[PDB]
Amino acid sequence: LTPPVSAGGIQAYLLTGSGAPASGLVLFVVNVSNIQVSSSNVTNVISTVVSNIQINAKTENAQTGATTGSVTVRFPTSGYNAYYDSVDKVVFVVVSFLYPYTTTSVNIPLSYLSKYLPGLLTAQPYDETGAQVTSVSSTPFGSLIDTSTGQQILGTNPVLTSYNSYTTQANTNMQEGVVSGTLTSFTLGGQSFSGSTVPVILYAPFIFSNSPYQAGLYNPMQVNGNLGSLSSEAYYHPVIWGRALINTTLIDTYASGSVPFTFQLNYSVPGPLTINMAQLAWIASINNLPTSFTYLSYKFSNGYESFLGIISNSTQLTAGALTINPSGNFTINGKKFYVYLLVVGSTNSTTPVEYVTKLVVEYPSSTNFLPQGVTVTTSSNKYTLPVYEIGGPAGTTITLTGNWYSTPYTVQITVGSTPTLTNYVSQILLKAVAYEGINVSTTQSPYYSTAILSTPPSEISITGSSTITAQGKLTATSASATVNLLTNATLTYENIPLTQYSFNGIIVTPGYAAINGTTAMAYVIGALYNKTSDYVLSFAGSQEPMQVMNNNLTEVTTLAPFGLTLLAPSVPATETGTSPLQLEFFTVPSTSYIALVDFGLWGNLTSVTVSAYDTVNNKLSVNLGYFYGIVIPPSISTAPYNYQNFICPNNYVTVTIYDPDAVLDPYPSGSFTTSSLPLKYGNMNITGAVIFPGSSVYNPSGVFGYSNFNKGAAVTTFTYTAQSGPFSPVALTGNTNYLSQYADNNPTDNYYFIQTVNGMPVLMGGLSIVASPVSASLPSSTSSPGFMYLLPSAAQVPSPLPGMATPNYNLNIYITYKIDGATVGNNMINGLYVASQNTLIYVVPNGSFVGSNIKLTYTTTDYAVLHYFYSTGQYKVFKTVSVPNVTANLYFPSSTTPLYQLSVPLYLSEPYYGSPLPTYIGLGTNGTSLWNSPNYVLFGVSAVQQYLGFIKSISVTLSNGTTVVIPLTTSNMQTLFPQLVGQELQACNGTFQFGISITGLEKLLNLNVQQLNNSILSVTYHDYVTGETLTATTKLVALS
Ligand SMILES: *[C@@H]1O[C@H](CO)[C@@H](O[C@@H]2O[C@H](CO[C@H]3O[C@H](CO)[C@@H](O)[C@H](O)[C@@H]3O)[C@@H](O[C@H]3O[C@H](CO)[C@@H](O)[C@H](O)[C@@H]3O)[C@H](O[C@@H]3O[C@H](CS(=O)(=O)O)[C@@H](O[C@@H]4O[C@H](CO)[C@@H](O)[C@H](O)[C@H]4O)[C@H](O)[C@H]3O)[C@H]2NC(C)=O)[C@H](O)[C@H]1NC(C)=O
Ligand SMILES: *[C@@H]1O[C@H](CO)[C@@H](O[C@@H]2O[C@H](CO[C@H]3O[C@H](CO)[C@@H](O)[C@H](O)[C@@H]3O)[C@@H](O[C@H]3O[C@H](CO)[C@@H](O)[C@H](O)[C@@H]3O)[C@H](O[C@@H]3O[C@H](CS(=O)(=O)O)[C@@H](O)[C@H](O)[C@H]3O)[C@H]2NC(C)=O)[C@H](O)[C@H]1NC(C)=O
Ligand SMILES: *[C@@H]1O[C@H](CO)[C@@H](O[C@@H]2O[C@H](CO[C@H]3O[C@H](CO)[C@@H](O)[C@H](O)[C@@H]3O)[C@@H](O[C@H]3O[C@H](CO)[C@@H](O)[C@H](O)[C@@H]3O)[C@H](O[C@@H]3O[C@H](CS(=O)(=O)O)[C@@H](O)[C@H](O)[C@H]3O)[C@H]2NC(C)=O)[C@H](O)[C@H]1NC(C)=O
Ligand SMILES: *[C@@H]1O[C@H](CO)[C@@H](O[C@@H]2O[C@H](CO[C@H]3O[C@H](CO)[C@@H](O)[C@H](O)[C@@H]3O)[C@@H](O[C@H]3O[C@H](CO)[C@@H](O)[C@H](O)[C@@H]3O)[C@H](O[C@@H]3O[C@H](CS(=O)(=O)O)[C@@H](O)[C@H](O)[C@H]3O)[C@H]2NC(C)=O)[C@H](O)[C@H]1NC(C)=O
Ligand SMILES: *[C@@H]1O[C@H](CO)[C@@H](O[C@@H]2O[C@H](CO[C@H]3O[C@H](CO)[C@@H](O)[C@H](O)[C@@H]3O)[C@@H](O[C@H]3O[C@H](CO)[C@@H](O)[C@H](O)[C@@H]3O)[C@H](O[C@@H]3O[C@H](CS(=O)(=O)O)[C@@H](O)[C@H](O)[C@H]3O)[C@H]2NC(C)=O)[C@H](O)[C@H]1NC(C)=O
Ligand SMILES: *[C@@H]1O[C@H](CO)[C@@H](O[C@@H]2O[C@H](CO[C@H]3O[C@H](CO)[C@@H](O)[C@H](O)[C@@H]3O)[C@@H](O)[C@H](O[C@@H]3O[C@H](CS(=O)(=O)O)[C@@H](O)[C@H](O)[C@H]3O)[C@H]2NC(C)=O)[C@H](O)[C@H]1NC(C)=O
Ligand SMILES: *[C@@H]1O[C@H](CO)[C@@H](O[C@@H]2O[C@H](CO)[C@@H](O)[C@H](O[C@@H]3O[C@H](CS(=O)(=O)O)[C@@H](O)[C@H](O)[C@H]3O)[C@H]2NC(C)=O)[C@H](O)[C@H]1NC(C)=O
Ligand SMILES: *[C@@H]1O[C@H](CO)[C@@H](O[C@@H]2O[C@H](CO)[C@@H](O)[C@H](O[C@@H]3O[C@H](CS(=O)(=O)O)[C@@H](O)[C@H](O)[C@H]3O)[C@H]2NC(C)=O)[C@H](O)[C@H]1NC(C)=O
Ligand SMILES: *[C@@H]1O[C@H](CO)[C@@H](O[C@@H]2O[C@H](CO[C@H]3O[C@H](CO)[C@@H](O)[C@H](O)[C@@H]3O)[C@@H](O)[C@H](O)[C@H]2NC(C)=O)[C@H](O)[C@H]1NC(C)=O
Ligand SMILES: *[C@@H]1O[C@H](CO)[C@@H](O[C@@H]2O[C@H](CO)[C@@H](O)[C@H](O)[C@H]2NC(C)=O)[C@H](O)[C@H]1NC(C)=O
Ligand SMILES: *[C@@H]1O[C@H](CO)[C@@H](O[C@@H]2O[C@H](CO)[C@@H](O)[C@H](O)[C@H]2NC(C)=O)[C@H](O)[C@H]1NC(C)=O
Ligand SMILES: *[C@@H]1O[C@H](CO)[C@@H](O[C@@H]2O[C@H](CO)[C@@H](O)[C@H](O)[C@H]2NC(C)=O)[C@H](O)[C@H]1NC(C)=O
Ligand SMILES: *[C@@H]1O[C@H](CO)[C@@H](O[C@@H]2O[C@H](CO)[C@@H](O)[C@H](O)[C@H]2NC(C)=O)[C@H](O)[C@H]1NC(C)=O
Ligand SMILES: *[C@@H]1O[C@H](CO)[C@@H](O)[C@H](O)[C@H]1NC(C)=O
């Protein structure tokens, strides 16, 4: 039993799982294991147990945590049912608290209850009065006695009132019901008993929890200290960046086991926004197009092309040798009209190019001056209508011929040299909405905890409200008029006679980089002038959004019409009027974050609202969650370093990158993937993003929230793996066609997550390395994303929530010469390499080592930062690590030395020569010096014999100014330094001791040993590492 029941302890468990007879049942167990019992004397012991039990009960406000009512009771002297098991050694009782069975006992199958007490399968439980019995049943709550009052509980009490009335009271008054128990300490048989149960929750409404996080959602990083000033407010004003997960907890007392939930997010901004739009098609009656104009069709990102629609009375349009047949046909009250759809381009194309799938035209009906409309169709009455391309070389002109009513007309098109891109710039009130799902499980009923995406990759709709307006002029037999919409789109009506219709209109699409042409919305206005009691001028028009796929432009949904009416009895008149207008665009999965960021809904001023839905038991939340958005640029830093950092194998230079927008999952080393499907939400089905924790990618089938739902074999499973080459780098593997759809905390691949269009990413983010002078860079053109494994550091013990990510990425760099020319089979050690996890090795040759360097560049991983900060270059940062020059010296221990001594010290000192012990320098031939160091190891590679310098000359000046330079023959080096080898004095110290033989020097000169030999000694060495020479001297003295 989890949690445990203690020695001599009481404990309680709320009954749950399939086969549990009723809601609001709690069991109590007393661990009577500590004493002897038999059927002969059991009635004593069970009676002894029950009399000491006390039970407490409350009603609470589920949001605020306030106690509303409290009651406290004990079992009656008789009429209870209470039971014993010899096998599991417990006394126990079950009590039924909510309606029904508040007052009457409900039977409990011995099968079900045995799940908790398996002894009930081993043998029958004992009853009161000591018999074996086949069944267990509740003691009802209304039977018990008020400890305050010494009477059976009355129907007037608010707690018993509430418990019987929970069904509506949970929602209507935010009421929650809670119970706990305690066994008043007592002695039996020289043993004793004591305890208090953990609280159990009977019921509560379905809500976002509001304690301690008063917004229901929280960012673990803001709560710990790692975000500056904003940490002060983590409990009531949560923030998060664009593509990541934010944490939350729900209470659900209905469900059991795992539960799919679905969420609805609504995004909003204070004040109106300036938006860019572009013209896809212009549609008109042949009277409204101008006598001549110059035009050439534009081509959108998807590959679709702009078109021109002409409506006419005639069965053809005619142009000499060229005949143009209509695309479709319609009628208004028996009068017949045809629609011709044209692309002005390259050549007179006989077969179709693209289509409109369905298209609504709208007119004021004579019957009412109230809007009506129809779908234009083919002659065979099918819906999709062909569009055709026509034209020629630049500067060519075509005349088309047609009729409007009984009057012929001609229009002259000049095929322009450059595409006719046209824009509208409007201010709109805009808002958006989106949907999402995940499958949450719990270790602790009734609390379900999870995370959800800041921006789900799925269809989003963006919607707004604006104005349309007309100015008009009336005459005895005709009207003239103009309209404005979308701030600076203008349409103009040719003067309409009494008893004639005419049309104008536009299809428009957003004007930005990636998404142009992919979604659009159509407005067509019919107009009418007629006379009743007054002259009547009237407008009626469709508003309908569309999307483009496979050269079809299609009605996604169709909205309610609008109308305007102007009237006067006066023959001369000027008039004015206005109406609201609606505007809806729908996005597509790969494009959704980019779209929100471009339109301006995502930024430091954005606020989000969130509501939730339980798929299985069908409930919506009685409250909402709230959070706000953020955009933050990166920064780079390093711990101060000196010459020590490059001496010895256990030293390095640390660089830290601060970039919070690269943390997508708050657990460092966490991974999730995502796909798009239909989701159940309330009484409807909508598309939305489904999150799936792990390293695998799915193309799932069916509808999320029903038995139709099934996810097949993984299409790919990404992994970081060890690989070939010296050291052993860890790097990413997986089919990169699916890399958008995968999320991680590694900046060297994260920039793909939802940021790929036409198979290519919009941002080249992440880390870049270049190194000098031995020419090397990472990554090579050949490299996968995720060429190195690189993770954010995790929060430590005094932090409230340990083990969660900090925005710091900590990266370690080694530069050395000592392992140059080491080998690993065929491999030769040269240049730059990745090692372990966050580690780089740069290896160079001996003379190239001083002044060598690495430059690191960091570019942001998130498209919001590229958008708001492009102006200033604040989205990229640099740092450089370089090896400084150091002082070196050669010295005798004293300026003077006696010819009494046989030998003297001569010390060479240079920091960069220092290593682990032992290490030694062997001399020989023409003054060569060879460095050796068998205890040097670095990631398994080990140092080879290095030639670091040479002794240049060995000289004496004699007592008269004559100078002798001793030639560096083998015999001369042999005699002068019989200890041919120098030794390091202390670990990683720069110092070695040589010993120069004065008793040698005497004989070596062939001089009169002491007689003439008041002399000065002078010696010189050259090192390749600094490029300096070192020189040293001593006076040789004898008794005078
Ligand atoms: C905020 O919400 C975050 C949601 O993203 C939570 O992150 C999840 O953290 C889990 C562990 O958290 C525990 O420890 C932290 C301290 O770091 C505590 O604060 C928490 O209270 C909690 O105690 C983590 O679970 C995994 O690691 C556990 C080790 O601690 C281990 O016992 C589990 O078995 C998990 O492996 C989640 O990490 C991912 O978990 C999923 C499985 S599941 O989602 O847990 O069911 C793994 O997917 C699986 O991968 C295996 C490969 O071996 C496949 O075989 C299998 O098909 C597939 O399901 C992921 O690999 C693993 O990374 C982590 N969730 C995610 C998606 O990252 C976070 O804890 C919340 N914060 C707080 C304060 O509660
Ligand atoms: C969205 O709001 C975020 C919260 O303020 C902003 O994040 C903060 O970014 C600051 C640097 O960018 C600032 O300067 C730009 C022009 O140079 C301009 O776009 C904005 O003015 C923008 O805020 C950075 O603040 C530093 O610079 C400020 C100059 O305006 C100065 O007021 C600050 O004292 C600071 O030097 C923030 O970095 C953090 O600064 C903390 C100081 S405090 O602001 O908490 O007092 C410090 O404790 C911490 O170590 C350091 O990281 C940075 N804030 C955060 C949360 O890290 C963000 O830029 C706004 N986004 C937009 C769209 O502008
Ligand atoms: C698509 O079909 C259209 C309909 O038949 C064609 O439109 C006609 O275009 C003529 C020009 O096309 C010629 O020159 C092109 C080079 O710029 C070449 O690519 C074509 O192969 C073709 O040879 C145009 O003729 C006008 O321009 C001529 C310049 O070369 C010149 O002859 C005159 O200046 C002339 O006005 C047609 O316009 C009409 O021409 C009538 C005389 S005739 O040329 O038919 O003999 C004239 O009476 C009338 O005023 C004028 O409007 C024009 N036809 C119409 C009425 O649309 C188009 O070429 C086809 N496109 C391709 C290349 O496939
Ligand atoms: C949320 O997570 C729940 C787990 O916590 C999921 O329940 C598990 O469902 C498993 C199959 O999942 C697949 O089919 C679902 C449609 O029914 C679909 O919703 C899922 O997305 C997914 O495509 C199921 O595993 C059984 O079937 C497997 C074949 O797919 C087979 O490999 C298994 O051996 C197993 O028979 C689990 O159901 C039950 O599992 C018992 C234990 S075990 O064998 O898994 O160890 C088994 O004894 C019993 O016969 C079987 O019915 C089930 N897991 C558990 C432990 O309950 C749930 O589907 C998820 N909900 C959604 C909507 O995604
Ligand atoms: C440390 O760096 C020093 C500076 O770069 C290197 O110094 C160079 O020394 C070369 C001789 O060293 C060779 O033999 C060693 C055996 O004792 C061996 O350990 C070395 O790996 C290396 O192979 C010297 O090269 C010349 O002398 C050779 C006679 O031994 C002869 O065979 C060569 O043909 C060559 O003339 C370099 O001196 C300069 O060399 C120039 C050409 S190049 O060798 O640099 O390509 C030449 O144009 C010029 O006239 C001559 O003075 C000398 N390099 C420089 C630029 O001073 C030292 O070897 C490195 N130590 C190690 C072990 O890495
Ligand atoms: C419709 O869709 C396409 C494809 O995304 C887009 O073309 C690309 O536009 C960018 C810049 O976009 C902005 O400026 C143009 C006007 O120049 C506006 O129309 C847009 O609304 C944007 O405000 C061009 O610069 C691209 O040319 C490429 O530039 C790259 C550098 S970049 O950082 O500037 O993008 C170079 O690396 C490429 O070599 C070069 O081709 C252009 N891309 C292509 C493939 O032509 C259109 O502008 C969009 N048109 C509409 C209606 O807005
Ligand atoms: C565009 O013109 C089309 C004709 O070119 C119109 O299509 C016709 O629509 C009628 C009424 O909806 C439909 O019944 C016709 O189908 C034919 O019906 C014939 C019998 S009858 O209707 O002539 O009495 C049958 O011979 C046979 O079932 C169909 O051929 C349909 N006509 C054709 C030729 O398909 C269409 O209505 C028009 N669009 C508008 C809105 O004006
Ligand atoms: C839109 O244009 C149509 C032309 O394709 C018009 O069609 C006309 O049909 C009417 C019957 O409704 C018929 O009287 C016409 O027949 C011709 O009459 C000519 C002279 S006139 O009467 O138009 O002045 C003669 O020249 C000729 O030999 C006849 O064939 C017919 N008009 C034509 C010229 O064919 C129609 O008026 C119009 N519809 C709408 C919606 O207003
Ligand atoms: C009363 O006290 C006993 C002393 O604390 C204690 O027994 C110890 O705990 C477990 C045995 O009980 C559990 O395990 C079984 C499943 O194997 C369940 O059926 C049961 O409900 C309990 O969860 C055992 O591991 C441990 O060795 C025992 N310790 C010793 C040495 O006595 C019981 O936990 C408690 N009595 C009962 C039966 O609940
Ligand atoms: C219930 O009855 C049993 C006897 O049936 C009691 O167990 C005996 O107790 C004595 C001392 O108390 C022990 O020395 C024996 O080992 C036990 N005998 C048997 C037969 O087990 C038990 O103590 C009684 N319990 C109570 C509380 O009265
Ligand atoms: C979030 O947006 C949704 C739009 O889906 C809104 O919910 C709608 O409410 C309107 C009336 O305000 C009703 O016509 C619909 O029944 C609701 N829509 C659907 C599809 O359920 C609502 O405006 C926003 N909700 C919140 C949390 O404010
Ligand atoms: C490295 O080792 C040398 C050993 O020669 C150290 O030199 C000695 O320094 C102390 C004081 O620090 C003097 O008392 C001695 O006289 C020096 N020895 C000789 C032979 O002169 C040197 O201090 C060490 N340096 C570092 C950086 O560890
Ligand atoms: C390290 O610094 C030393 C000292 O300034 C440099 O060597 C000196 O400068 C020139 C070389 O251009 C020589 O002629 C002198 O003899 C050197 N001076 C001394 C004190 O002997 C050296 O250039 C620097 N090393 C590197 C490679 O950066
Ligand atoms: C759009 O045109 C194409 C012809 O390529 C056809 O696939 C489709 O039936 C039309 N409309 C739709 C998507 O119904």
Author numbering: 30 to 1069
Verbatim from the authors:
In archaea, S-layers usually form the only structural component of the cell wall and thus act as the final frontier between the cell and its environment. Sulfolobus acidocaldarius is a hyperthermophilic and acidophilic Crenarchaeon and thrives in acidic thermal soils and hot springs worldwide. The Sulfolobales S-layer lattice stands out from others because it is a two-component lattice, consisting of the S-layer-forming SlaA and the membrane anchor SlaB.
A pH shift from acidic (~pH 4) to alkaline (~pH 10) induces the disassembly of the lattice into its component subunits, while a reassembly occurs upon shifting the pH back to acidic. Asking whether this pH shift-induced assembly and disassembly mechanism is based on a conformational change or partial unfolding of SlaA, we investigated the structure of SlaA at different pH conditions. The resulting cryoEM maps had global resolutions of 3.9 Å for SlaA at pH 7 and 3.2 Å for SlaA at pH 10. As for SlaA at pH 4, domains D5 and D6 were too flexible to be resolved in the cryoEM maps. Strikingly, the cryoEM maps of SlaA30–1069 at the three pH conditions were virtually identical, demonstrating a remarkable pH stability of this protein. This suggests that a pH-induced conformational change or unfolding in SlaA30–1069 is not the cause for S-layer disassembly. An analysis of the surface charges of SlaA, including the glycans, at pH 4, 7, and 10 revealed that the overall protein charge changes from positive at pH 4 to negative at pH 10. A comparison of the surface charge between glycosylated and non-glycosylated SlaA showed that the glycans contribute considerably to the negative charge of the protein at higher pH values. This change in electrostatic surface potential may be a key factor in disrupting protein–protein interactions within the S-layer, causing its disassembly at alkaline pH.
